[PDB]
Design a protein around this ligand. Structure first.
Ligand code: NA
Length: 259
């Protein structure tokens, strides 16, 4: 007869975007047996050829992109002090005690790469010539009220000093997403920009100095942008849900591991 809602959820888990089949008068067991055989063969092809994870391979492809363009690869701690978040302009219980994974009474999981990269910009200005170009790829954490990934991988590149203009920032974003093969559109008039993909925010870039720069020893012009790698993988592979691209035991490269 007709497929139930739970049976449809099960088949959608085993359903790849490349599959060109409709959910045909066949029973649920026949459809499930077909998708199971396809997903098993898909993993067999990965285990015999590529064997690289989508998240890891994307980090390596992005790293080669910015290293080739004069950006220094940064690997800052994931466990940051709480004082870094208090210095970002967040206190009370608006966003400090709501979307922050605190570990000890002093440390917490970093929700963004900006505080660590800001400290690197201050220290590297004493040794490196102008301009200072750095970037980092790493995990970030934010709770939830909303609906998004709590454990995700962030990319943050930034430049300080000369050439920190909106035109230069958009040229880097354009060359970056065209390199990967991701359609986008820049939205902006707030002194900030939004890199959108239809209705999904890929990145939120910041141009020019910010009054908050004084609290981080920053007194030069700077540009930067932060991309979520799980959101990028969802767009490139046309995943219906972003959880197929995140760190999980339930999916490998958008393929279900519950076979
Ligand atoms: Na602006």
């Amino acid at each position: 007869p007709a497929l139930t809602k739970s049976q449809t959820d099960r088949l959608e888990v085993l359903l790849n975007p490349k599959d060109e089949i409709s959910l045909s008068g066949k029973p649920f067991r026949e459809l499930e047996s077909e998708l199971l055989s396809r997903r098993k063969k898909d993993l067999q092809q990965i285990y015999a050829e590529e064997r690289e994870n989508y998240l890891g391979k994307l980090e390596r492809e992005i790293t080669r992109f910015f290293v080739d363009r004069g950006f220094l690869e940064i690997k800052s701690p994931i466990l940051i002090p709480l004082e870094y978040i208090e210095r970002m302009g967040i206190d009370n219980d608006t966003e400090l005690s709501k979307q922050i994974f605190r570990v000890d009474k002093n440390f917490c999981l970093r929700p963004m790469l900006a505080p660590n990269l800001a400290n690197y910009l201050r220290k590297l200005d004493r040794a490196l010539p102008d301009p200072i170009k750095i970037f980092e790829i790493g995990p970030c954490y934010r709770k939830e009220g909303k609906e998004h990934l709590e454990e995700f991988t962030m990319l943050n590149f930034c430049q300080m000093g000369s050439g920190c203009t909106r035109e230069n920032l958009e040229s880097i974003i354009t060359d970056f997403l065209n390199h990967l093969g991701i359609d986008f559109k820049i939205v902006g008039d707030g002194d900030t920009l939004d890199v959108m993909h239809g209705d999904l925010e890929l990145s939120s870039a910041v141009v020019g100095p910010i009054p908050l720069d004084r609290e981080w020893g920053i007194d030069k012009p700077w540009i930067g942008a932060g991309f979520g790698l799980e959101r990028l993988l969802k767009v490139k592979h046309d995943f219906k849900n972003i959880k197929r691209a995140a760190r999980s035991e339930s999916y490998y490269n958008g393929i279900s591991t519950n076979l």
